[PDB]
UniProtKB/TrEMBL annotation, chain D:
Keywords: Capsid protein, Disulfide bond, Host nucleus, Host-virus interaction, Late protein, T=7 icosahedral capsid protein, Viral attachment to host cell, Viral penetration into host cytoplasm, Virion, Virus endocytosis by host, Virus entry into host cell. The lineage of its organism: Viruses, Monodnaviria, Shotokuvirae, Cossaviricota, Papovaviricetes. GO terms for molecular function: structural molecule activity. This is Capsid protein VP1. One of its GO terms (cellular component) is host cell nucleus. Belongs to the polyomaviruses coat protein VP1 family. Forms an icosahedral capsid with a T=7 symmetry. The keyword Secreted does not apply. Homomultimer. It comes from JC polyomavirus (JCPyV). The gene is VP1. One of its GO terms (biological process) is endocytosis involved in viral entry into host cell. Its main location: host cell.
Length: 257, 257, 258, 259, 257
């Protein structure tokens, strides 16, 4: 039972932070990148290296202690940080043609963010059920061929940063009543990134009943993926490249029964 | 004669489910994929195997037993499940260029969904009237050259899963008064998938008179196609890849005369 | 004519539902919905396309319930391209995209066009190349000059015959068509992907800025269409236009006029 | 100019309907609507395009019913359309096959679709890709160009006051002027970009500013301007020519009293 | 405390100007272009010359002295100047194919503008932390591998024209309360420019409380980047090409406490 919003100067708070991308970080110089992408010969032999696998980002943000009142998330401003880095087409890249600049970051992207009053709820789905996910990651267990389309056994919480690979988990549309999530997968090997920035855009997080995510235990959960595409090295080897995401959330106190 | 909506706590219900894709499933490891695509050498000799043909998906969901009242479908939330699986560019694929990642799923897609109070009504249309559709599928019978543009003999109901090939049937626009349907064919051999996910988007199913689909015999019909594109293996052979679709439908009791 | 009040009551509304088949050229008994393979002339001077290679506009004249002054006024339209999923047949006599791949799908230049009017669609002729010889059996801009490549006001016609007016040399005349509503999109490029949407939830309102729809002269409704979806490439590389049928549902009401 | 009330009554409205032909260069007696085939200089300093290779702005000055209280015709709405979009379906004439046995490559690549309605000539600012480009006799071009002309040289001010004379590539609408004109344009670059051309008789553009006032026609003349470079046509040899189309305009005007 | 707006003839003013692009200007004939782009052999050896690096544009515009009253920026009209120069495909470019016209300007673009009552606040982010930025530029200092995703040390003000390289700075979303900024990075090596011009479009600069940027010390700050793409010359070498941006801003006097 959601009751009235509290008013007064004391009745609002805001959270501001950024989430770093978790692309794999294959050495001490390659934060924000994955390891070079290799191709297994068969579905059966697919055994991706941990450093080759982008993972979901998550932060649990403690809010001011309330107690029954709960913090309600009302608005979000969000932004991908560092979009102009993609203008570095002069570093270790592959010339597009003789004497040309380096091919820029392009290809498959996944841009995703969520705000909730509890951990994002995940459903596991795998491209290839015979993929062996590596030690150090949290992945769909006991996968069967049905896991390639929908296996309801694969339920998890996004409760650990740099652990849940992007490719084998999505938000669970059968749950997540207390989260708002948004994402876009743009495929193709050459697809161009299109990255917009502005400080004038706000997303309202209220549902159809005028209620936003309610923060259980006075914690706010923010999640993100910003795989921007792949960087191609001079040899032609490709690595995922990601960027950080800014969040600013405005919250208000709501009485509940 | 549609009369008033019933109110009270007892007067609403919801259906939540998913429909798996039916892409052909050529072996025990390839759920969600078709058989590799082969090309006939003439129009006359076109004779696709069943496991090479994506089919429409359908589920008929029983609703709480009534009785006249009928359940009226009012809103829909829907989502393609497992969009991030398309980031697996590391297995059984063909490098985009020397030393690159595997070419991702791309090319022709068809994303389609419908919600109705009875089976989706279909009209048959064929690319090539001399195509021999295989045993175990339901296809336009007695096809003539006119069937390549419009032959009104080809009427059917989507009343069996894993049976009506996508390529030879479409929703019948002369019927379907009691269904709401939505589809997009995106062609081209290289077209990139663009897949959005969110739990914040609702489609209203009411017609211009404020009336949604009315569920005959207390059954709700959900139909879907989500052919995402084709997967290319190292040799260049291509197979369709599909994903499951989530549905959540809100219904209310309506009195009719 | 002064437009006066709309008539009401059960008897005052009617609806037309039909489909228009595409007229792509139909080069043999097996190839309804396709054109003949496209050949390229050596020079502008020698351009002489065969009739079976030229998509034409589709038109249907639909008789309405007899009136009488009352006229039927067309108010709304639902329309849809029929058979969009046929483009998923990439296993039939096509050219593989690469070694061992599926066939190249239908793609490239498309023209999707529809109109609803109370009289024939009015056409203006414009030619890519004024030296093109349009074939016997078509209706085309006559006495074409070099100015016909940009605008020659002599080239006026009515879309009054099916499978006769080639798409490439006629467009709706923007100086006329007061009693028609028309809509079209040319999407060019040899590789451009079709994007075809279907739904039974979309309605176009046909009323002008004064609240008046097309008024059906002689109790006839005119429907016109083109749905050239792109080109099909066969094994040899030869290309043919492929078209699809278009569904129309029009709601009409009786309107009194002076 | 104080803008006062609109006149009403049957006498107080008029309309202009016309078309503007494209001015692509017209290199011979058979090639109206096309430019000469494009050739490329070997250095910036030797860029010297021939007039027939250069698309120019189109303009028409349309006399209105004579009015002279001071009354002026006020342009209120516009309907506009590119004429002949389906000509781009001729892929069977003197073209270059896309692949063995294929149809001809259609018109594609860089396009500029532009139109304006004003109560006086469109005001232009000159900007050049390369300041050492020598524009040819019979065109009007930025004079005394310097290297700063490649980004902004305020000396280069002109009026679009002559048809088939102002090359498209070295002039744009001057955003520091044009108070009495409404203009709209889109440059879509790339050598392979597909034309996307929409036609309909159901679309109207309102020409009123934020104060409810449309272009006011000085001396009872209405100025219409356009460019509709649709892309390039590729001949069998590979040589490329710009192809343009005409533009239809219908403008509704009303009488407005001014002080 | 923002109080009432002043009214009357004297209470408004406007700024109209243009900002030239700062692409590098490698010689006396190449204003608006960068130096040809060269590619470093390794990430470690990336050492771009200043004339190869586009920089942010900025103008500080003095307003009529007020003193408490401040000028408040309310509306913006803006336009890229010279869009039709991209139609010069006859000036030492590289033919698209034998006998063809020159390839036009295409590939990565960044179009950005801002209006504020103080300098644009910047956050440094680098593609490659081992890039050595050149003398004469202002760049992220003490860069570490963390600078590739987010290093909060890299804070700056856009306070000097032709000095802050585009590729290593973005607007800081954690600041800029008194600025409105808007930008789009469109990547890919072949992406077509799409440039719209009109004198009929206005952007409102008021925030959700009805308050525009407030001009501290009676100065208005305008900033821009309009990298349109790369020009490829006959040799295959590629250079950035930029264009100027027009600004017209309307301001009103606002009382504050
Ligand atoms: K494995
Ligand atoms: K057969
Ligand atoms: K001829
Ligand atoms: K010169
Ligand atoms: K270095």
């Amino acid at each position: 039972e959601v009751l009235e919003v509290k008013t007064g100067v004391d009745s609002i708070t805001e959270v501001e932070c950024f989430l770093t991308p978790e692309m794999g970080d294959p050495d001490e110089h390659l934060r924000g990148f994955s390891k070079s992408i290799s191709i297994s010969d068969t579905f059966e032999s697919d055994s991706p290296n941990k450093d080759m696998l982008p993972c979901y980002s998550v932060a649990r943000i403690p809010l001011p202690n309330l107690n029954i009142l709960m913090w309600e998330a009302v608005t979000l401003k969000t932004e991908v940080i560092g979009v102009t880095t993609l203008m570095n087409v002069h570093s270790n890249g592959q010339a597009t043609h003789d004497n040309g600049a380096a091919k820029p970051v392009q290809g498959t992207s996944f841009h995703f963010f969520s705000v909730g009053g509890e951990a994002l709820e995940l459903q596991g789905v795998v491209f290839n059920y015979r993929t062996t996910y590596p030690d150090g990651t949290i992945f769909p267990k006991n996968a069967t061929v049905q896991s390639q389309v929908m296996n309801t056994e694969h339920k998890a919480y996004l409760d650990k940063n740099k652990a849940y690979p992007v490719e084998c988990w999505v938000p669970d549309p059968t749950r997540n009543e207390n989260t708002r999530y948004f994402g876009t997968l743009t495929g193709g090997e050459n697809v161009p990134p299109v990255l917009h920035i502005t400080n004038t855009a706000t997303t309202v997080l209220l549902d159809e009943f005028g209620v936003g995510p309610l923060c259980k235990g006075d914690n706010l959960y923010l999640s993100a993926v910003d795989v921007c595409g792949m960087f191609t090295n001079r040899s032609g080897s490709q690595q995922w490249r990601g960027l950080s995401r800014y969040f600013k959330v405005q919250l208000r106190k709501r009485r509940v029964k």
